[PDB]
Amino acid sequence: QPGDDAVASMQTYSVAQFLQPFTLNPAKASSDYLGKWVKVRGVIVDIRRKSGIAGSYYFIVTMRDEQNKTDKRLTFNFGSHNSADVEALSNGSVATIVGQVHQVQDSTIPTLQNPKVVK
């Protein structure tokens, strides 16, 4: 996972910007981004705790473009160990979250993994 100074050093994408390549070809985009970390800024529109498999639970955080420059939403999957970050977000509030691209299947939009709320 990237630490604070590595995070401050990354470019901030809008949701529209990060999703643009996936809109063109998600197979290609998923392959180009595989394993990479992105820092995406947007408005949180849903936060939800979910029942996991094998005793676990996790959270899905959904984000829309800050200026509605796309209607597509980006989701992030936070494990139970990062409930502090999830509990500090707010629906309707702008946030910036760093997350990792894992393989995108059965979908055209990635669900960012191992996320970290920046601000």
Author numbering: 36 to 154
What do the authors report?
In conclusion, the crystal structure of KPN03535 reveals a novel divergent member of the prevalent OB-fold and suggests that it is most likely to be a nucleic acid-binding protein.
The crystallized protein is comprised of a glycine left after cleavage of the expression and purification tag followed by KPN03535 residues 23–154. The final model contains ten monomers (chains A–J), two PEG molecules (PEG 600 fragments from the crystallization solution) and 323 water molecules in the asymmetric unit. The ten monomers are almost identical in structure and completeness and superimpose extremely well, with pairwise r.m.s.d. values ranging from only 0.2 to 0.4 Å. In the crystal structure, the protein assembles as two stacked pentameric rings, formed by loose interdigitation of the ‘finger-like’ β1–L12–β2 structure, with outer and inner diameters of ∼80 Å and ∼40 Å, respectively, and a thickness of ∼40 Å. The buried surface area of each monomer within each pentamer (∼540 Å2) and each monomer in the interface between the two pentamers (∼600 Å2) is low. Crystal-packing and assembly analysis using PISA supported by analytical size-exclusion chromatography and static light scattering suggest that a monomer is the likely oligomeric state. Analysis of the electrostatic surface potential indicates that KPN03535 most closely resembles PriB and aspartyl-tRNA synthetase, with a prominent positively charged area similar to the DNA-binding region of these two proteins.
